[PDB]
């Protein structure tokens, strides 16, 4: 029920800054990062596939806005139409030197932060009649989502070599409630109401719009994977998408945390996100969705 039920207290021999000396150290590893070998014997999960380059502690994962600017002889045309779905003529066009600041927020199932719609929730699919195509919903009013890892983590440094340090979770104290995200129940209900209203235009007024939760697959695809405060969350979002629509309170999404990240859906290049000292707190805007329809 606690955060401590998600952790394994793993002890191992580590190299010292002197090649001929060892170092009996320990660290708290999440159960999602250790795989048993058959005080039992375990090993890090991405160890038969690659070696994990440690997420370097002095570089931040916070996305800064980047503008993509066209070279000489080219121009960037910007569609200023407010009802422009994603395709076809755009009556109002502009030539911008280059784009607005696009924050590269990396997330799944929910478009955290970013740009809102102008007048109404926009539904954008390559072929709305094809269930194999994702539907990019864009909100007009953001839905605020609050993260947390209540634990007061204690980062610990291990010298694994000359000049190289390994940052490990030495101890965990404080509030041991599981990491979670809160979405306002009233705000989310009226946002799905707007999504449903704009979604019946493509399927019928008398059709029944039902939101179910993710089908299956990797934890990166079945969960609202995202980064917040340098530590990577994987939230359930099964209480967000659970409703059937016929023609102060809050929603708490239990989130797991991992330290070994295979981010860009690749195999062979993992990354070890080092522990973040202290309590992590999070304020984001849900500005969109990525939906898939059932055949």
């Amino acid at each position: 029920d606690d955060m401590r039920g998600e952790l394994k207290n793993c002890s191992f021999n580590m190299t010292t800054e002197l090649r001929d000396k060892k170092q009996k150290v320990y660290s708290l590893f999440y159960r999602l990062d250790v795989v048993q070998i058959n005080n039992k014997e375990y090993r890090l999960i991405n160890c038969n596939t690659s070696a994990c380059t440690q997420a370097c502690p002095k570089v931040s994962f916070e996305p800064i806005p980047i503008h993509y600017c066209a070279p000489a002889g080219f121009a960037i045309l910007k569609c200023k139409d407010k009802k422009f779905n994603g395709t076809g003529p755009c009556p109002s066009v502009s030539t911008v030197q280059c784009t607005h600041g696009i924050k590269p927020v990396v997330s799944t199932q929910l478009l955290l932060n970013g740009s809102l719609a102008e007048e109404e929730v926009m539904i954008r699919s390559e072929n709305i009649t094809n269930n194999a195509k994702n539907i990019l919903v864009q909100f007009n009013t953001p839905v605020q989502i609050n993260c947390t890892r209540p634990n007061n983590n204690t980062r610990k440094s291990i010298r694994i070599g000359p000049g190289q340090a390994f940052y490990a979770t030495g101890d965990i104290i404080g509030d041991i409630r599981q990491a979670h995200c809160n979405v306002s129940k009233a705000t989310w209900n009226e946002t799905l109401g707007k999504v449903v209203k704009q979604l019946r235009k493509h399927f019928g007024n008398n059709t029944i719009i039902r939101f179910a939760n993710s089908s299956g697959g990797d934890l990166e695809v079945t969960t609202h994977s995202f980064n917040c405060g340098g530590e990577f969350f994987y939230c359930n979002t099964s209480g967000l998408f659970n409703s059937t629509w016929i023609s102060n309170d809050s929603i708490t999404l239990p989130c797991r945390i991992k330290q070994i990240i295979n981010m860009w859906q690749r195999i062979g290049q993992c990354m070890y996100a080092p522990p973040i000292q202290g309590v992590i707190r999070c304020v984001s805007n849900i500005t969109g969705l990525i939906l898939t329809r059932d055949g």
Partner: antibody, heavy 127, light 107 residues
Framework: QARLQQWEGRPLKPAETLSLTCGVHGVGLGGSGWGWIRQPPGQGLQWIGE???????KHNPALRSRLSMSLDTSRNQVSLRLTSVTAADTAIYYC??????????????????????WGTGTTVIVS | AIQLTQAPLTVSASIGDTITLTCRAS??????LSWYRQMPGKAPELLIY???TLRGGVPSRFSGARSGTDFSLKIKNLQPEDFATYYC?????????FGQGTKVEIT
């Protein structure tokens, strides 16, 4: 057999430096925290200061800027360097190990420090 | 800082009695209050930590209670080794403080 041994430093002249040293046997300086407790004659105990597991120096507000402690990891010794000693500082000085046990209140986990292991006593008299 | 008030400053009882010692805190220090016994001339030793947990080796007669402000320690089946000075020590706020000391003697 785990004991903290400290030896008498003999009487010292007023307005000098008070150098104490505690010998840690059975256990080592790592992992716990090490502090100093005194006891003026005919009175109760008084907290001087401690170094916690993190290496961070908690000091009593009453003794301002005259406190300084250090840990000799190589020799397993805890040192006290009280300066400008006045006649009111005549007390038996104890070296203690503030041990951390985690106690779970309903939803909160805390490091509880409870001075597991006490020294023997160093009667310090200034005249 | 936090001030711990320990009363009565001197309680007298014969061998084979039951005594209750009180240590009242200023603020609420949760349950973080440990008890130390100082035999005359010796060094203080830990009896109870977290106001309820018995130290390894302390007989089951010793017991504490309460997690608010009026902490209490109860001794059963008094023996000559229990006639010492008891101190209550809080561990909530970093300006640490001790009790005044309850000197338990024979009548």
């Amino acid at each position: 057999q785990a004991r903290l041994q400290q030896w008498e430093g003999r009487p010292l002249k007023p307005a000098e430096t008070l150098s104490l040293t505690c010998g840690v046997h059975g256990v080592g300086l790592g992992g716990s925290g090490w502090g100093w407790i005194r006891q003026p004659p005919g009175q109760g105990l008084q907290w001087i200061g401690e170094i916690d597991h993190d290496g961070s120096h908690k000091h009593n507000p009453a003794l301002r800027s005259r406190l300084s402690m250090s840990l000799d990891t190589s020799r397993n010794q805890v040192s006290l360097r009280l300066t400008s000693v006045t006649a009111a500082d005549t007390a038996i000085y104890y070296c203690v190990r503030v041990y951390r046990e985690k106690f779970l209140i309903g939803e909160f986990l805390t490091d509880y420090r409870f001075m597991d292991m006490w020294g023997t006593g160093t009667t310090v008299i200034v005249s | 800082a936090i001030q711990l008030t320990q009363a009565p400053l001197t309680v007298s009882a014969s061998i084979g009695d039951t005594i209750t010692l009180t240590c009242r805190a200023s603020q609420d220090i949760s349950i973080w209050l440990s008890w130390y016994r100082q035999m005359p001339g010796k060094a203080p030793e830990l009896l109870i930590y977290a106001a309820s947990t018995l130290r390894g080796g302390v007989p089951s007669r010793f017991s504490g209670a309460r997690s608010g402000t009026d902490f209490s320690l109860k001794i059963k089946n008094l023996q000559p080794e229990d006639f010492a000075t008891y101190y209550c020590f809080q561990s909530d706020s970093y300006p640490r403080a001790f009790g005044q000391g309850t000197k338990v003697e024979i009548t």
